[PDB]
């Protein structure tokens, strides 16, 4: 029941690892627009991730993803036969 | 049941509305002018549409449907025949 999540979290990292940055900006405004119509956004200028933060949220996830995957894969083949 | 020749009667209702103008007035296709060679230039790119030319035939050639459609389809059509047929002709009714 972990082995699916965290075998998910990993396959979420690539999004953070593989992508632009003024992209989620360019997107974050379409958002910010819809937001202003109802009067619900501006204050605390919502901003995309800090080029290298984006890399910080790669990696870190790619690891706690790709890793606990086996932490699961393991404890599941020594408990019970072996 | 199915009036099959209800509608093939029907479609050469309209394309005899095609037998049209090749015959009468002038040389044919009202020209070519535009087609080979090409347009002024034009260049929107471009014309010609008139909402007004539905007149001329709609009354004249209203008949054409009939001509096969009537007496010629379900006719025994071109019964009034004979006219050189040793190799053979007839053509004898499938009706």
């Amino acid at each position: 029941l972990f082995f699916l999540g965290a075998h998910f979290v990993w396959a979420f990292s690539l999004m953070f690892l593989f992508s632009g940055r003024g992209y989620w900006q360019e997107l974050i405004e379409s958002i910010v627009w819809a937001h202003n119509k109802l009067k619900v956004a501006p204050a605390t200028q919502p901003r995309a991730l800090s080029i290298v933060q984006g890399r910080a949220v790669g990696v870190t996830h790619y690891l706690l993803g790709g890793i606990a995957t086996t932490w699961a894969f393991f404890l599941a083949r020594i408990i019970a036969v072996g | 049941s199915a009036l099959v020749i209800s509608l093939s009667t029907g479609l050469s209702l309209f394309l005899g509305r095609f037998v049209f103008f090749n015959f009468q007035r002038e040389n044919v296709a009202k020209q070519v002018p535009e087609q080979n060679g090409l347009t002024h230039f034009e260049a929107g790119d471009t014309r010609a549409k008139e909402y007004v030319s539905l007149l001329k035939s709609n009354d004249p050639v209203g008949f054409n449907i009939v001509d096969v459609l009537a007496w010629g389809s379900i006719g025994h059509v071109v019964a009034y025949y004979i006219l050189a047929t040793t190799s053979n002709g007839y053509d004898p009714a499938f009706f």
């Binding site: 119509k37 109802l38 009067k39 619900v40 204050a43 605390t44 | -």
Partner: protein, 154 residues
Amino acid sequence: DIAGLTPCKESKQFAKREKQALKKLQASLKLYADDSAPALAIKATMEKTKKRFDNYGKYGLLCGSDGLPHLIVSGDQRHWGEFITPGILFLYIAGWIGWVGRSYLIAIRDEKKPTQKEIIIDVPLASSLLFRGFSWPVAAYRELLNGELVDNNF
């Protein structure tokens, strides 16, 4: 009734699910609490999923094959409150999340400079604003369409 086979009143396939499974989780012949005071499969965890019973409620409830329930939610027969009953509920609760979203917000921008009030939060949850949300009768549902947020504010 609508295709997945019918309710509790009979769903054999469903019955077989009741039984094996749990009843076997039972089928550890014992493992021993003959007095013993702790270990709780024994009592409920079964019985709390188990004194689920020819009763469940009753609930209708469709039970496809393998007798797991399917939810139609049509407006028919038995099934209406498998979406609407807990549907308007979802709506009502949300929207009184964001009616106050569009509130401990449209209350500042104002006075002497308000540039990040927002990260500390006087009063928390707005609260004051909060109850506005249950005390919406109608609320946005006409005021959003007229005046205040108004087409001009549009």
